[PDB]
Amino acid sequence: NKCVNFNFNGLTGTGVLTESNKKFLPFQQFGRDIDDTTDAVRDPQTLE
């Protein structure tokens, strides 16, 4: 809920991080937008 430089696994980018409502499938790691920009991501340490 604050603007941050996020990085998961080398994905440096600047944004508000927010808790998603997206039901990613079990195997599934990055979410890309319609624009093919990353717009969601599973945390590597914790299951969110």
The minimum distance between CB 15 and other proteins, in angstroms, equals 28
Output Rg (C-alpha) for the chain, integer angstroms.
11
Q: Where are the alpha helices (DSSP H) in the chain?
A: none
| Eight-state DSSP code of residue 35 | T
- How many other CB atoms sit within 10 Å of the CB of residue 17? 13
The minimum distance between CB 14 and other proteins, in angstroms, equals 31
The minimum distance between CB 23 and other proteins, in angstroms, equals 14
Give the interface size with other proteins as a residue count (CB under 8 A). Answer: 3
Residues that bind other proteins (CB under 8 A): 25-27
